[PDB]
Amino acid sequence: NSNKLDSKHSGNYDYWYRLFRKSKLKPFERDISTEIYQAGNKPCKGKGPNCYFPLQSYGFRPTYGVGHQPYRVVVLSFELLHAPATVCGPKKSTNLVKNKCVNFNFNGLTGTGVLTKSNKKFLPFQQFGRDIVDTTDAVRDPQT
Amino acid sequence: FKNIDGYFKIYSKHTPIIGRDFPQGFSALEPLVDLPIGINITRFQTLLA
């Protein structure tokens, strides 16, 4: 809840929200437009009967309900796929050891196995690698 | 090109091929860039020199 940034005396209707769209919204698609929403039959290039503005003001005026307060909502979209990572958390930089059975956590990919220098042909955009049956087989060293 | 869930993709491969026209021999297509645009796209035109 954000009552100290979206509320002020005598009301505050700065925000907006849409209810009138020609179709349903596909995921992560913005439809920002002030095109007058004419359902009607006539063109209605302007406002008026049965041809109204597509977005209304949320009317976030101070407090008029616990379920009607000004909630600030932010969504975080991660992509947990096999691709070169950009964001992490705390990092330890233990030196790589080969020809030995080690637990590895390479760029979020955790597992146990033995590592060794290989003679594969990773293209500069290839990161994870695999074998015949869809399992991580060879991970190229991101440093060296 | 494609823009599924954004992420405009450009795959490229250059070869001074025989040069007659659109050829027949197969060729892989390596990616160059991968940029998460996150916008809406519907048409396609091109600039010239």
């Binding site: 293209l123 990161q127 690698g129 695999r130 015949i132 | 795959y11 050829p23 027949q24 297509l29 990616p31």
Partner: peptide
């Protein structure tokens, strides 16, 4: 002004779907 000739695509247009190495 440009022409609008139609041709057959033959076999073409296959890229690497992901960043995962494979062989055989």
């Amino acid at each position: 002004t440009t022409t609008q000739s139609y041709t057959n695509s033959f076999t073409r247009g296959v890229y690497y779907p992901d960043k995962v190495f494979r062989s055989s």
